[PDB]
Design a protein around this ligand. Sequence first.
Ligand SMILES: *[C@@H]1O[C@H](CO)[C@@H](O[C@@H]2O[C@H](CO)[C@@H](O)[C@H](O)[C@H]2NC(C)=O)[C@H](O)[C@H]1NC(C)=O
Ligand SMILES: *[C@@H]1O[C@H](CO)[C@@H](O[C@@H]2O[C@H](CO)[C@@H](O)[C@H](O)[C@H]2NC(C)=O)[C@H](O)[C@H]1NC(C)=O
Ligand SMILES: *[C@@H]1O[C@H](CO)[C@@H](O[C@@H]2O[C@H](CO)[C@@H](O)[C@H](O)[C@H]2NC(C)=O)[C@H](O)[C@H]1NC(C)=O
Ligand SMILES: *[C@@H]1O[C@H](CO)[C@@H](O[C@@H]2O[C@H](CO)[C@@H](O)[C@H](O)[C@H]2NC(C)=O)[C@H](O)[C@H]1NC(C)=O
Ligand SMILES: Cn1c(=O)cc(N2CCC[C@@H](N)C2)n(Cc2cc(F)ccc2C#N)c1=O
Ligand SMILES: Cn1c(=O)cc(N2CCC[C@@H](N)C2)n(Cc2cc(F)ccc2C#N)c1=O
Ligand SMILES: *[C@@H]1O[C@H](CO)[C@@H](O)[C@H](O)[C@H]1NC(C)=O
Ligand SMILES: *[C@@H]1O[C@H](CO)[C@@H](O)[C@H](O)[C@H]1NC(C)=O
Ligand SMILES: *[C@@H]1O[C@H](CO)[C@@H](O)[C@H](O)[C@H]1NC(C)=O
Ligand SMILES: *[C@@H]1O[C@H](CO)[C@@H](O)[C@H](O)[C@H]1NC(C)=O
Ligand SMILES: *[C@@H]1O[C@H](CO)[C@@H](O)[C@H](O)[C@H]1NC(C)=O
Ligand SMILES: *[C@@H]1O[C@H](CO)[C@@H](O)[C@H](O)[C@H]1NC(C)=O
Ligand SMILES: *[C@@H]1O[C@H](CO)[C@@H](O)[C@H](O)[C@H]1NC(C)=O
Ligand SMILES: *[C@@H]1O[C@H](CO)[C@@H](O)[C@H](O)[C@H]1NC(C)=O
Lengths: 733, 725
Amino acid sequence: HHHHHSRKTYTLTDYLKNTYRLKLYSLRWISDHEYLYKQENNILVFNAEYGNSSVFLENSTFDEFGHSINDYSISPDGQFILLEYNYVKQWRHSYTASYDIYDLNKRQLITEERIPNNTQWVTWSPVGHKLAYVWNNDIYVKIEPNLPSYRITWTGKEDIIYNGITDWVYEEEVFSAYSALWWSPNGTFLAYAQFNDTEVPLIEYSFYSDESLQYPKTVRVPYPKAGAVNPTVKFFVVNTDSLSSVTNATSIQITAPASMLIGDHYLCDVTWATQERISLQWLRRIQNYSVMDICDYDESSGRWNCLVARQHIEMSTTGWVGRFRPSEPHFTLDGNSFYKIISNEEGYRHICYFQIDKKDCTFITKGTWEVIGIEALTSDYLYYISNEYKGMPGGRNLYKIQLSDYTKVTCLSCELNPERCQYYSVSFSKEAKYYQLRCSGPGLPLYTLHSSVNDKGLRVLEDNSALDKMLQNVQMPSKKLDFIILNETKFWYQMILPPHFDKSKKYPLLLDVYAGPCSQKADTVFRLNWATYLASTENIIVASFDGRGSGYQGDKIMHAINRRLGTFEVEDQIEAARQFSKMGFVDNKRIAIWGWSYGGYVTSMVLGSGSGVFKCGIAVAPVSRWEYYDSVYTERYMGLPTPEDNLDHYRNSTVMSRAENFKQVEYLLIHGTADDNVHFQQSAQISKALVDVGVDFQAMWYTDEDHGIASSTAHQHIYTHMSHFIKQCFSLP
Amino acid sequence: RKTYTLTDYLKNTYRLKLYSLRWISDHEYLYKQNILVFNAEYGNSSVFLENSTFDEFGHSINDYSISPDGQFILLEYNYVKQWRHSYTASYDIYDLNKRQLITEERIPNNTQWVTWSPVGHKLAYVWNNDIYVKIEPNLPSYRITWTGKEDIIYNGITDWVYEEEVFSAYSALWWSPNGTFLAYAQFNDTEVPLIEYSFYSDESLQYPKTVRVPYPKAGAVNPTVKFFVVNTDSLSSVTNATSIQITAPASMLIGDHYLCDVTWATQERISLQWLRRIQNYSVMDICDYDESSGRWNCLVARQHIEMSTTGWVGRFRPSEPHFTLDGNSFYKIISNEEGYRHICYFQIDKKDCTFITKGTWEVIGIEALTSDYLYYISNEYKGMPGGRNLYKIQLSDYTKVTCLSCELNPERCQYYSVSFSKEAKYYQLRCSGPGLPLYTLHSSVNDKGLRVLEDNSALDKMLQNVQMPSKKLDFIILNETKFWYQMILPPHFDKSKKYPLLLDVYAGPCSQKADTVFRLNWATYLASTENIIVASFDGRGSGYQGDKIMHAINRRLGTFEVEDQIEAARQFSKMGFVDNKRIAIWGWSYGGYVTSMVLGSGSGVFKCGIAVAPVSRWEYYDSVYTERYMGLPTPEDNLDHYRNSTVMSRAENFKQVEYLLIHGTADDNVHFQQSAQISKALVDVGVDFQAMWYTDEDHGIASSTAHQHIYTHMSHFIKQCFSLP
Ligand SMILES: *[C@@H]1O[C@H](CO)[C@@H](O[C@@H]2O[C@H](CO)[C@@H](O)[C@H](O)[C@H]2NC(C)=O)[C@H](O)[C@H]1NC(C)=O
Ligand SMILES: *[C@@H]1O[C@H](CO)[C@@H](O[C@@H]2O[C@H](CO)[C@@H](O)[C@H](O)[C@H]2NC(C)=O)[C@H](O)[C@H]1NC(C)=O
Ligand SMILES: *[C@@H]1O[C@H](CO)[C@@H](O[C@@H]2O[C@H](CO)[C@@H](O)[C@H](O)[C@H]2NC(C)=O)[C@H](O)[C@H]1NC(C)=O
Ligand SMILES: *[C@@H]1O[C@H](CO)[C@@H](O[C@@H]2O[C@H](CO)[C@@H](O)[C@H](O)[C@H]2NC(C)=O)[C@H](O)[C@H]1NC(C)=O
Ligand SMILES: Cn1c(=O)cc(N2CCC[C@@H](N)C2)n(Cc2cc(F)ccc2C#N)c1=O
Ligand SMILES: Cn1c(=O)cc(N2CCC[C@@H](N)C2)n(Cc2cc(F)ccc2C#N)c1=O
Ligand SMILES: *[C@@H]1O[C@H](CO)[C@@H](O)[C@H](O)[C@H]1NC(C)=O
Ligand SMILES: *[C@@H]1O[C@H](CO)[C@@H](O)[C@H](O)[C@H]1NC(C)=O
Ligand SMILES: *[C@@H]1O[C@H](CO)[C@@H](O)[C@H](O)[C@H]1NC(C)=O
Ligand SMILES: *[C@@H]1O[C@H](CO)[C@@H](O)[C@H](O)[C@H]1NC(C)=O
Ligand SMILES: *[C@@H]1O[C@H](CO)[C@@H](O)[C@H](O)[C@H]1NC(C)=O
Ligand SMILES: *[C@@H]1O[C@H](CO)[C@@H](O)[C@H](O)[C@H]1NC(C)=O
Ligand SMILES: *[C@@H]1O[C@H](CO)[C@@H](O)[C@H](O)[C@H]1NC(C)=O
Ligand SMILES: *[C@@H]1O[C@H](CO)[C@@H](O)[C@H](O)[C@H]1NC(C)=O
């Protein structure tokens, strides 16, 4: 006699086998009024206006193909489809693949002059059907899909010269992309970066492969660790309309400002402003100074001129420039003006309006909140996401501001579904006539389509009723999102609370940590994850805290750990734990901490702190000392590890130096052997230091797994392993 | 009141005293304290060098070495370990008759091997893979070889696989008995593939180093070998030394082969043994110096073949010959018709040898040979394969055999080794168990005891206070055949009680884990403090009991020796004092393989286990060892069984057990690879297990801190498996 009360919980197997599936609604805008979507592997076009859809491409159209198709891309003009197959993953964004082009009009595979195997990147021009691709680190252009390619670059060289694609650090830390090609708006020009890794040292590590491989392979990747020789970069623009089968193409170089050339620098943003005007942002290796150049094509010479009178400097006295890099400009149609996110006088990030000829910009938004991103710009309105609503830095809503009157700001998303929806992202149609809103929480995700004309809702695309239906009699956890005041400053936390949460009781507490610069772990997003299991099934509170160095609340918080990683952010997690115990529903003897990546570092620094607050913790793929990690991320926050810069704090902020203090705690250290990002080295050095002072700890290596430890089997194994460790640390049967 | 603790084991609270002498003549020996010479006669000892004669040397002296004539001492410093035996060092020579360091024409830094000639004070050494000879310590050295090249050509020193698996040594230099000739081998690793692994080094090193070592895994291209002899009495300052090659016999040059033994017979006769890559066929060459030629000749009529139809040849390699004084006769250990290893007497000029020992037991080694007597160690006494005693056989009558050690102290002493003086007039006996080690000195003329050198009374006194475990050594019968086991039994062993049991396994070919040796080790702690029985069992494949048992796993690694550890454990649970809910198993090296194969067997006998630096599949291990037992991993040889004998293939069965897998990341021997493939296989079938890597540790995991950490980590694991707080 169970009286239909909820007795199921969200189990580990539920998490690992995806029993409860979040439904997405992924679409790709092709025009201002149409998008594509998949239904049972068929590709449908949907017309946003009248809600209808015709099948665009049958699920069976490439049955005969003979290869499994990984992805596709349709040309802007709708006449060709690019089919990607033989996908082989490289780093976070990079991969190689084979490509075939299918003619949608003639309904046939192009068979002549095919894109080669092992292609590294492919991109349609933004209009028409020109193709640029990179193969063997060289850029090629096809003006028509069945015609011979024009080789643009001849300097490409494996691990040394990269044309049109990024090297390792630029991929992971600057562009968040493999691609380093930018077509001009109408496809006349093709801009590209060339990276030179010639004297960049190699990280070398073993890759064991299938058990058939008799001798392990040594992988060798150019990787600048902090203070090491960095890649250099050059920027070019080629006119694709004046290509020629008989003469090699002329790439016009756009050189960095002298203020950048006097030392090590980076190329940190590329943005076309018009058909004949491109903006570049460069960044000094000491990343507190950046320069935007605005460069016009000179018709009579066929070269590019960046007028000093249109240079813009963005700098910071309290930290680095930008959240992770200088923000990108959104240009007006005429290219004489642009909008960009920068920190205001009070350290808050807001949209500034620039004319290209003027040094002073004027802020169009302000307040003790921040603009997350500029999402679209029309002639009358600018659309942006911000955390203004209710002063909740972990919320996200879409707003629009009238360009002619800045006091006219409308929230488009705030009141749509206030209880269910407080974390929005947006996808606008090609000229902003429609937009898809994606609400990610705190309720179940919700995908809606809107006409921007008068912001009326057209329809619900996906409302996750199937999941809602399944969860009716499952004892799910809740999320408390709130703040504590420390030194007259709000710091936000979230708690994943077990079902039937009773403040009278004392719960074990797991502190789930990132805490890196501009991190945010206290937000309104709904998640089905390991923490859901721990709270639901194992009755553990899983909490996260955004202390100093956290993002989206201004520079006085975010920049507080400048040049001082492994200090305040570490201390604030410990303090968070003390505060959580102060709240009266936490068992002080069963507080644990875990993190991945920066969170691994913090977890480790906390467990080695001697605080006595934490019984145990898990560090997954942690940084152990900053000199081991890449230059652009590390130096952003730490400067250079030289006696004249910041070597002392590099040396003071290691987990190894704290080995002795791990005698007080139970520690599990986990690392993938093929981690190209945070090298296995980092954990190898932790383990060696703990061994050297005689502290027992648990370890797990993951053969051939990288930073994501994301293989289906490894992912299940690591979470199972961590679950056993936590349960035993907390004496849960 | 107290027990033998883990800290006791880890910190060496209770030390075993050795007595390590080094003979200088037929009646004198050195010993450390200070360095005394001792008389074998009287035991009177005048000092040779004061504890700090080298007070103002400045360098920490690793080891010393006196020239045979006593005129010079060689000081070794700046020791840096390479592999198991190999190392690099700096060297200085001190004139004893003048009392001063030689300062001219010194031995280079990073010298790889140095050796005195067997008489006088000639010196040969290896530096940058080339051989140099010094006639006098202060004079310039003559360069013998010019082909030495790092990782590629090795003159007078072994490459990785020859060091580890053939010679158990770095040196490949062999002086003739009076020092006239210097014989040397030359190895060529040119097409041997490289094992590559990361070395993380000190925290200060920003980018890991990639260590690369030529290492032939099973079936890979092997090193090639050449053998040379040079006359050191006709070296020139003007002309280059002329090294005479001795080529391997035509029966070996037909394919891949190995040089497996070098034994000088006389001043002008050298014996070489060669082994085919398929190691069931070896040939001994006897080569004589020709004065008018200046050449060495090995008559095909003097070739002696040793082969096996049931396995490989030798225990780990063909045995060494012991030539009579005139060098026309020799004695060596070979398998007889019944498959037992016994001493055969060969005449240089003929095919048939005659066995001078016989029976169902084995000769372990020929220890010394005189005109009247051959001295040897065997396990004959009481039919106990795990005992060892010294015997002498009257050369004029083989039926006259005296056991010299059996009856000296039968209770305390059943495991002897021996060190004879230069002409076998005196000998030191070393008893290693079952009681406390006992070192005694004896005169061979009448095999009388002279004196106790070390009796470990100091250790005996300390142990009085400690609840020490006992050893049971006994056998069981499987298929009308005896298989021996030993058990470390906790103190106050109550056979009406049910004890947890840990099976300690090696179980490799020619292994022996059941013996009469006394040990203070991890098992002592587990027995004394944790009341765990620690058992070992010598099944099929095990050694010193004849070929029928040893060759039983020929071409079939990971079969019978694995089943027999399982069957042993079953038998132990039927002994009534074993808790069958708490049986574990662990092992290192081959024992990690077997442990892993056992735990993946699905037998249900074992709750848990620990594999340390295990082999996971035979293609990952070196060619010399692996192929000895497995042949080649090719379709026409033994590929199928290479494929059938992996621990990865048993991954699914690890669901029934708790496994701890441990490996050093700089293991040059069993590559970290092997455990990496185990862990991946267990991950891929969703088996949870425990792991531990040891950063920059090698196959020994022998760094002081790492040693303590692994045993501590393992102890927690077994205690938790056994529900011991
Ligand atoms: C990439 O950068 C390297 C420098 O790291 C350039 O190599 C130098 O080239 C100049 C002129 O040819 C020489 O004087 C230097 O000696 C070179 N230095 C080296 C090889 O370390 C190289 O030219 C660059 N390559 C490209 C294609 O831009
Ligand atoms: C072996 O190396 C040592 C140390 O590097 C040598 O001694 C050094 O010799 C240099 C001259 O080359 C002097 O400047 C140093 O003062 C010496 N250092 C020390 C610590 O002694 C030594 O001479 C080298 N070679 C031999 C044959 O001994
Ligand atoms: C060591 O072995 C290598 C590999 O067999 C020998 O190298 C060959 O030498 C011959 C004649 O000099 C060349 O024609 C081949 O091309 C070489 N092969 C290589 C390098 O792979 C080498 O001669 C041997 N060295 C010694 C000292 O015995
Ligand atoms: C002893 O032999 C060596 C090695 O062949 C000779 O040294 C080489 O001589 C050749 C040319 O004659 C050079 O190309 C080599 O580079 C030399 N050195 C080495 C280390 O290979 C040496 O000349 C010979 N000595 C005498 C006295 O004949
Ligand atoms: C937890 N977490 C993330 O989810 C994403 C991260 N970065 C942010 C900067 C841009 C990308 N490189 C992704 N980082 C930063 C980081 C810090 C380290 F110390 C070591 C490794 C990473 C990494 N991937 C994180 O920590
Ligand atoms: C337990 N144990 C030993 O104590 C000594 C061993 N060898 C015997 C042959 C000569 C030397 N290589 C020492 N072996 C053999 C072995 C087998 C493996 F499968 C993997 C690795 C080793 C190794 N060192 C052992 O197993
Ligand atoms: C939607 O409806 C209109 C009818 O006016 C039609 O012309 C258009 O092609 C339709 N699009 C579809 C079904 O995708
Ligand atoms: C790519 O791969 C396969 C061969 O493995 C072949 O069928 C195809 O023609 C290759 N080359 C190109 C240019 O596609
Ligand atoms: C283009 O450049 C390459 C290399 O610089 C050269 O070999 C090739 O001949 C050139 N082609 C033309 C048409 O100039
Ligand atoms: C693209 O832009 C360029 C530069 O303004 C211009 O010359 C060209 O006419 C444009 N092409 C098309 C097809 O609109
Ligand atoms: C940039 O950083 C360096 C080192 O921290 C500092 O000396 C310099 O003044 C900074 N620049 C600005 C504009 O704050
Ligand atoms: C021991 O005594 C003898 C007796 O004369 C003496 O000749 C010898 O040198 C001594 N040996 C040692 C090592 O003291
Ligand atoms: C050493 O043996 C060699 C070769 O037999 C011989 O020529 C030489 O005379 C011997 N030397 C001495 C001093 O015995
Ligand atoms: C050596 O081994 C091979 C392969 O097992 C076998 O065929 C051959 O007969 C053996 N040789 C001898 C002499 O037994």
